[PDB]
Every structure is written in structure tokens, then in C-alpha cells.
């Protein structure tokens, strides 16, 4: 069982310490700001469940940039808008299940600093193409991870596989991944949960609208620079 705060997920499991690191608070020797950062423990360190996305046949992929998925949800989103800095890990739990007759594979992969690229133009992606919010995004070209890199080498990143034969869940436990100890949440996204149909959904049974539900629990949230909300 993954019980964070008042949230819980009864699991049956195989998680992923991303880069071997567990989310912890900022140590006082690596601390930078002179004031003590607030730590809203049970109010933010809990499973924030996003919308479910329809895992279809002609699906390309889905990406949620963090904490851009969570800047407007619950007491994490209220702490984000009221504090200039933050430092949070993440415990992404991705729920996707089907019958024992469905086939399919998910590369649930969490990408640190997913600088996207637009296709067939020299113009950089704008604000509206990157900061999609809680709705997330959709890969235009998942085979190259929308930045000219390769999907084949995307397993160098913290990843878990939802093979609908074997397992029905992916748990990636992300630490604070930034060059800076804290950062401004409304203009930067350290991680990016990329969920990608490497093997598409296929079956011969009656068609069910199979979704992929995403529960993202922030972990060890610090916040600093308290002011009015935006």
C-alpha cells in the first residue's frame, strides 16, 4: 500500500527510485535562502490524480510536465501560487489495466528537463505549447520524443513498463531534479511524465474504452518566498 497523507493506493508493488535517489527535504548545508522553508507535509504529500486519457489504438502518447500538472490542484496548487520557491519530489503512480485478453505496452518514462522541439520549423515552442497544465499533452512524434532524440534510448531515463500481460501499474519515485535547490514553479518544469504506446492496445474481444489514469503524489514539498497568490 502507498499511503501518502490521507491518500492511499492499495498495491500488490515494483517501484522505481529514480536515479537511485529517494525524495528528501533540502539539507541545511545545501540550503540557500536564509529563511526556513515551510513544509506542508500531509496537505501536499498525497496522491493528486489527474484526468484519465483514453488508451486507444491510434494513440501516440501523453506527457505531463511536473509540477505544471499540479499548479492548480489542492493544497499543492495553493502553496505553489502563494510561495515563490518550491522543492518537491514526486511519486508518480500510473494506473492502466485491461483484461487478460488485451495486449499492449506502456513506456511510462519520467524525463528530466524535457526541452521539447517543434517539428519542421525553426521557431521554438511557445508558452501555450509547453505549459499545458492539468490536461497534459500529446506527443506529436513519440518515436523521437518530440525533441529529435530517440524513443529507443529513452530507457536511460527513470522508466517503468506497463506490459498489460504482466503488470497493471507503474510507480516512479522522482527526486528533486534541478541544478538549483529550489525553483520558480510557474516558469519551469523539472520532470515530464511521458506515457507512450510502444506496443499499441490490441484485442479481439468487445471493445472497452480503456483509460490510463495518472496519480502523482508530490513528495517532501518545501515552499519558500510566501506572498500573495497569482
Amino acid at each position: 500500500q502507498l499511503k501518502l497523507g490521507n491518500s492511499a493506493i492499495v498495491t500488490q508493488a515494483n517501484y522505481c527510485c529514480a536515479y537511485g535517489e529517494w525524495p528528501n527535504y533540502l539539507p541545511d548545508h545545501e540550503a540557500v535562502a536564509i529563511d526556513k522553508p515551510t513544509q506542508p507535509e500531509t496537505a501536499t504529500d498525497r496522491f493528486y490524480t489527474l484526468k484519465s486519457v483514453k488508451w486507444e489504438t491510434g494513440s501516440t502518447g501523453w506527457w505531463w510536465k511536473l509540477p505544471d500538472a499540479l499548479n492548480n490542484i489542492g493544497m499543492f496548487g495553493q502553496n505553489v501560487q502563494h510561495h515563490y520557491l518550491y522543492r518537491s519530489g514526486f511519486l508518480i503512480h500510473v494506473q492502466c489495466n485491461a483484461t487478460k485478453f488485451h495486449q499492449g505496452a506502456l513506456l511510462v518514462v519520467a524525463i528530466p528537463e524535457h526541452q521539447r522541439g517543434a517539428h519542421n520549423t525553426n521557431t521554438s515552442p511557445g508558452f501555450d505549447d509547453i505549459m499545458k497544465g492539468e490536461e497534459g499533452g500529446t506527443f506529436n512524434h513519440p518515436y523521437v520524443l518530440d525533441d529529435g532524440t530517440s524513443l529507443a534510448c529513452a530507457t536511460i531515463f527513470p522508466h517503468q513498463w506497463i506490459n498489460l500481460r504482466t503488470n497493471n501499474s507503474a510507480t516512479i519515485v522522482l527526486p528533486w531534479m534541478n541544478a538549483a535547490p529550489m525553483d520558480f514553479p510557474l516558469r519551469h518544469n523539472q520532470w515530464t511524465l511521458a506515457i507512450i504506446p510502444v506496443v499499441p492496445l490490441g484485442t479481439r474481444t468487445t471493445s472497452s474504452m480503456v483509460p490510463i489514469t495518472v496519480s502523482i503524489a508530490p513528495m517532501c514539498c518545501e515552499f519558500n518566498g510566501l506572498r500573495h497568490a497569482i
Binding site: 519542421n120 521554438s124 509547453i130 525533441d147 529529435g148 538549483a180
Partner: protein
Amino acid sequence: QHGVSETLVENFLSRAALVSKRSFEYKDHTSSTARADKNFFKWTINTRSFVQLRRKLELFTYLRFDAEITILTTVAVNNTYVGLPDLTLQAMFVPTGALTPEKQDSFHWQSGSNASVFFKISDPPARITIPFMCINSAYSVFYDGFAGFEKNGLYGINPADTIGNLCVRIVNEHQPVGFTVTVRVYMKPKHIKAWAPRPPRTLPYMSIANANYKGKERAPNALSAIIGNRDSVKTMPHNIVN
């Protein structure tokens, strides 16, 4: 019992690779255009202008290196030929966004606080060591986010990742014939601590400001086909036939 010391990231990335190259004219610039280099050039020091060092440094998300800038100046003549001059060059290091000079003989080249280096062509190349100057603890090679607090900022360009400006001029005055002075800058990153390895970029680069992609028209390194095609999955291309 094989040594693995050549694949060290301190050995992998510390190749003094070409990062800048301008053949700029050296003549009477009293009648030249405004875009042309009037015996000086600024260069915002980035790792991205040349795709071979860029793809090596884009293997990682965060890099902490000390740029060892080596400036190779070489000279050619633009009817008759005469001897090549021993030109003295200044390469003043200006920080990111600070005042870069607008002339050759402007009073910004006095270097009252900026780091300059006065070198000649016939000397060995000017090798300086620019330190790790990021305000963060590593260079965000890929920066998912925006710099400004408003919504007009450039995506991917963190100014903390930006090294600075390398304003290079020729200290000599104009001479009665025109020379073409090509300045090649070779940055060797050193004392390298590399974090979070990434997929190597397969598609060719489009711009230095971002990670846009187009791919080749056909395989290999195309968008729909990175690896070059073969006949079937059961067809061996380089099969031995005896």
C-alpha cells in the same frame, strides 16, 4: 582486465572542439555595411553552434565544467599577394548581457575590469580558462521552462546556462590592403561532473536556440525511420555468402 579509463566523462567530453568560427574582414570599414564586422566580433559563448560537441554535451541534462577557451586566429589576404601580418588581437570576455563594444577603437576595450587576452597570430593560440560560472550548481543543458516571469520568454534558453560574450577585436589599425582574419575558438570543457544521461540525438539539428527536428528525407536518421531500412525483419544485410 580491460581498462575502462577512456570512457570516463572527464575523458569523453574534454576534447577541445570547435565552438566558434568567423572569417571577418580587416580593412577600411568607412564604407562597409552595418551588419558586417568592422574589425571586431562579439560571440555569445554557447556549446551549440557546432553539432559534434553539442550532441556530446546534450548526452547529459546537467553539466558542471570549466571552459578552457582556446582562440586560434589565422589570417589570409583578400589582387597581388604580400606577406601576412603579425596582427595583435584582443579577446575581451564580456558577461551575459553586459556592454559589448560597438567599434574597434571604442573605450570599452580598455578592460578596466573585464578579462581580456592580448595575443598575436604568430604566437601559440591564446588558451584561457573560463570557470564554472553558472549561478546554479550545473549548466542546465536542456532547460524545460522559461527565463522570464512574463510569457514572452525564450523556451529552453536559461541565461544561467549561457557562458558569456567573447568580444574579439584586432588591436592593430586598418592597413592599406584587406585581410580575411578567421578566428576559430576551441572550448575544452574540463573538471566535468555530468548528471542525468539522456538519449543521444538522432535527428539532425535545425537551430541552436532549441531542439527542433526535421529529420532526413529518407532513412537513416529520418523522422519516421531513424535506422536505415532493409528488406524484411528476416533479411540479413551484411550476410556472409560463400
